[PDB]
Amino acid sequence: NAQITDGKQYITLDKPIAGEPQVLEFFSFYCPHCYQFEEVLHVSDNVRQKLPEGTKMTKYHVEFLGPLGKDLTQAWAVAIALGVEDKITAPMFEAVQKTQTVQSVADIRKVFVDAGVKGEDYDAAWNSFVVKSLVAQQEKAAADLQLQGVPAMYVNGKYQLNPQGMDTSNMDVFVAQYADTVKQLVEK
Numbered sequence: 377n378a379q380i381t382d383g384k385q386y387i388t389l390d391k392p393i394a395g396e397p398q399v400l401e402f403f404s405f406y407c408p409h410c411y412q413f414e415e416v417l418h419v420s421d422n423v424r425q426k427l428p429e430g431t432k433m434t435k436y437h438v439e440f441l442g443p444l445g446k447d448l449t450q451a452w453a454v455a456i457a458l459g460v461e462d463k464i465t466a467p468m469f470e471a472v473q474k475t476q477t478v479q480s481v482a483d484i485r486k487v488f489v490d491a492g493v494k495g496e497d498y499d500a501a502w503n504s505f506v507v508k509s510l511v512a513q514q515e516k517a518a519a520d521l522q523l524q525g526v527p528a529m530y531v532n533g534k535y536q537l538n539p540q541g542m543d544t545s546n547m548d549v550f551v552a553q554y555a556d557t558v559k560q561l562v563e564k
Contacts, residue, residue, distance in 0.1 A: 378556060384541040385557040389534055393520045396533035397434035398562060399427065402518060402526050405472045406442035413527045415469050417547060422555040423529075431562055435461070436514040438526055444481065448472075451484045453510035454501040463491045531561040 382388050401420055403410040413419050424433040437452035439445040448468075455464045464487065471487050472478045478487065488498050501507050517523075521530050529537040542553045 386535045387538050392534035398431050400530045401435040402528040404438050404441040405468050410527045423558045426555045426559045447481045453507040457501045457506050467491050535561050
């Protein structure tokens with residue numbers, strides 16, 4: 377059956393925020409731990425797979441890491457606005473961290489284009505009011521929730537996941553524990 381505990385597998389915010397997405401992840405394409413999180417452990421997908429139906433997995437990008445943090449945050453806004461997150465996430469992590477072929481803003485676009493995204497759509501999205509507000513929203517969320525680092529996950533703007541208090545002696549275990557903790561938090 378299982379049961380989680382405040383202070384252990386999660387922590388409760390002293391200043392919860394209303395109106396946030398139910399399951400909100402922060403990440404950076406630059407961060408090695410975010411790479412492991414997303415591309416090796418596939419934490420988020422495991423979480424999403426245990427999520428009570430009707431509940432969506434939301435991910436925001438952060439600007440405070442790396443030389444292109446701001447522009448990658450805007451590119452992620454485009455990915456959201458175009459609905460191409462699933463086509464882009466793996467290529468970008470590889471291009472940024474592994475092949476290290478993302479050195480400029482133009483190189484970001486190439487990842488989208490190479491991934492199947494029409495350049496005309498990318499360009500339209502990039503300069504849209506829509507994307508401009510998505511950027512603002514990503515920035516605002518991290519501030520409101522008092523983000524200290526990535527990766528990070530918050531549930532109902534009230535609980536923060538705390539992997540340090542999980543069992544990290546085995547990764548298959550840890551992932552299952554992370555997924556279940558989120559599930560329990562959303563049913564709460």
